[PDB]
Paper text:
Kinesin-1 transports numerous cellular cargoes along microtubules. The kinesin-1 light chain (KLC) mediates cargo binding and regulates kinesin-1 motility. KLC comprises an N-terminal heptad repeat region that oligomerizes with the KHC stalk, an acidic linker region, and a tetratricopeptide repeat (TPR) domain containing six TPRs (TPR1-6) (Gauger and Goldstein, 1993, Verhey et al., 1998, Wong and Rice, 2010, Zhu et al., 2012). The KLC TPR domain (KLCTPR) is unusual in binding to multiple ligands using distinct sites (Hammond et al., 2008, Zhu et al., 2012).
To investigate the molecular mechanisms of kinesin-1 recruitment and activation by JIP3/4, and how this is regulated by ARF6, we determined the crystal structure of the murine KLC2 TPR domain (KLC2TPR) in complex with the murine JIP3LZ to a resolution of 3.2 Å. The crystallographic asymmetric unit contains a single copy of the complex, which comprises two copies of KLC2TPR bound to one copy of the JIP3LZ dimer, which adopts a parallel coiled-coil conformation. The KLCTPR binds JIP3LZ end-on, via TPR1. This was unanticipated, since TPR domain ligands usually bind to the concave inner surface. The KLC2 TPR1 α helices pack flat against the side of the JIP3LZ, lying across the JIP3LZ helices at a ∼90° angle, and oriented with helix 1B proximal to the JIP3LZ N terminus. This buries 571 Å2 of surface area on each KLC2TPR. The KLC2TPR binding site spans heptad repeats 2–5 (residues 433–435, 437–442, 444–446, and 450) of the JIP3LZ. The JIP3LZ hydrophobic patch is recognized by a number of hydrophobic side chains that line the inside of KLC2 TPR1 (Leu201, Leu204, Tyr208, Val216, and Leu220). Around the edge of the hydrophobic core of the KLC2TPR:JIP3LZ interface, the side chains of KLC2 residues Thr200 and Tyr208 (TPR1 helix A), and Gln223 and Asp227 (helix B), hydrogen bond to the side chains of JIP3 residues Asp450, Asp444, Lys435, and Asn439. Comparison with the crystal structure of the ARF6:JIP4LZ complex shows that the KLC and ARF6 binding sites on the JIP3/4LZ overlap, consistent with KLC and ARF6 competing directly for binding (Montagnac et al., 2009).
Residue numbers in the entry:
A (entry chain D): 417 to 477
B (entry chain A): 191 to 421, 438 to 477
C (entry chain C): 416 to 475
D (entry chain B): 193 to 422, 441 to 477
The structure:
């Protein structure tokens, strides 16, 4: 029983370290997805601003 | 030949990021979970498990878990020898990595065969006179320099220079870097005239690139100082490699007694 | 109460394991979405810099 | 309705819980809850938000007792932090009431629904269309209890909002008039339900073929004329009406009227 408890405590600690590492990465990955989705919305605006400027130039030349 | 596959790219950067922040408690477990996810699908003997193990061993290098890092790299090379076969660039990359880990711990002799096997793998795939074979010969020369194997250093740097000078241009910085390293090795052997000629070669090419071919007027920097020793100056301080040369050859003229020559060369280097 | 302790450790180990595997699943999915986005942001950065040069080409 | 930082994780939870990847959704929710109490503390609008999400995932799993408990805790946080008579508090009460009704705890769900309608009225206004949607839902909770009078009151209030606030052509109006007529039929208020059905048919007919004149009589008026013996509206609500009024004519003995109305509905 004592040997089994020791092993379970070792495994529980190892699992906990990994769970907390995975939680840290998951949080960081969400923030990178949020920064990217926001940055893509910026670029989508810049592209549709120049797409209208394409027609504005042609009306002159 | 250290290509990181498409999948591992993001996780790999995340590992490096955490291991640089010194968040080892995050980096090591990320590596460890990724390894289990890789064996689930691929199986231990896989190029991706080998890649993932090499990454972790470099994280264990940063921690100074040198025995762990060594073991991990041995396992990675073992996978790479089966999966990719012996005499593969990935196998060469791992041996270099293992040799870099040994040199760090001062196990220069132990790192010597690994480096030698990798150079042998490089020569087979790239060709004897490939520029990467020259980069390997240079690395193997550093290994011998650390062991104080003076003759070996000269051979390896001589082979490297042969590749550099013929395969690449004379203006290439790799050529000047080798000629400065080889001249240094000569100075240790007491081959003073050999190192002097090497320095002169460097200075003369530098001068020629700046002001065309050497004629009556438009003599190089050294030739101006050697003539100065018997009794204006246009010298370009372009490269840090060219300064090392100027300082070196200057000191070398101080040994010869040609002090005015040592002076003008020191001054041009100062400028 | 060795038996009571073992039971609790087994419960905690399972809870931890469930969470670790859920976190691993999400992290993997989040990486794939970052890869899809970084690739898509490259297409857009390329498209924007192609039209920025085309702005000058039309004016000429 | 969800705070800025929680938005991504929230979607991720909904996505996993929709894919039926419960083994992923539940632990993501559970870890996020611990991360929220670390910073904010249990009594927080974000912990309340996060708990509501999880109890809805437990509803999908049919962990009904867990879902109920989780929502009670969430409403408790919402009463402190956001205060009583808050829309978030109303949303939770509706959630607990929907969970209770599903289990068949109709009487238990009845006060919750009543409190939420009271919150809705305060914030939106007595005659708001959402107050009408709430009154309709509360009327349905009494129908399941067989509280006939209550059903009639609530559907009567709902119709008042629908008919005046929105147009007569609105489908919400026809839906209510059909539901209220049904409630009448259960009470034995046959003539009341009949008039309701007629109203529906008459507006439908008018939208299609202008104002009702001598030549242009509605569908029912044509059948009532047919009983003294000598359409194709693709609206499902208008079919229910046609069938239901036919059923009434069938009970009234006006069989030819029940027939023509059944036929038009068949068409």
């Amino acid at each position: 029983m004592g040997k089994e408890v020791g092993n379970l405590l070792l495994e529980n600690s190892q699992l906990l370290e990994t769970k907390n590492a995975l939680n840290v990465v998951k949080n960081d990955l969400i923030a990178k997805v949020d920064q990217l989705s926001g940055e893509q919305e910026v670029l989508k605006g810049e592209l549709e601003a120049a797409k209208q400027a394409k027609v504005k130039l042609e009306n002159r030349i | 030949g250290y290509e990181i596959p498409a999948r591992l790219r993001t996780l790999h950067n995340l590992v490096i990021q955490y291991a640089s922040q010194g968040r080892y408690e995050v980096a090591v477990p990320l590596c460890k979970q990724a390894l289990e996810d890789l064996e689930k699908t691929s199986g231990h003997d896989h190029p991706d498990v080998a890649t993932m193990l090499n990454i972790l061993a470099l994280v264990y290098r940063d921690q100074n878990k040198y025995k762990d890092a060594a073991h991990l790299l041995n396992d990675a090379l073992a996978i790479r020898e089966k999966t990719l076969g012996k005499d593969h660039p990935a196998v060469a990359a791992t041996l270099n990595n293992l040799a870099v880990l040994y040199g760090k711990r001062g196990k220069y002799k132990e790192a010597e065969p690994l480096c030698k096997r990798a150079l042998e793998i490089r020569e087979k795939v790239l060709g004897k006179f490939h520029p990467d074979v020259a980069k390997q010969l240079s690395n193997l020369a550093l290994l011998c320099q650390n062991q104080g194997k003076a003759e070996e250093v000269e051979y390896y740097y001589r082979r490297a220079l042969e590749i550099y000078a013929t395969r690449l241009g004379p203006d290439d910085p790799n050529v000047a870097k080798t000629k400065n390293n080889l001249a240094s090795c000569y100075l240790k052997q007491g081959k003073y005239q050999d190192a002097e000629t090497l320095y002169k070669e460097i200075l003369t090419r530098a001068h020629e690139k700046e002001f065309g071919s050497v004629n009556g007027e438009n003599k190089p920097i050294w030739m101006h100082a050697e003539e100065r020793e018997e009794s204006y100056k246009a010298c370009k301080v372009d490269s840090p490699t060219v300064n090392t040369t100027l300082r070196s050859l200057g000191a070398l003229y101080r040994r010869q007694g040609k002090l005015e020559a040592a002076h003008t060369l020191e001054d041009c280097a100062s400028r």
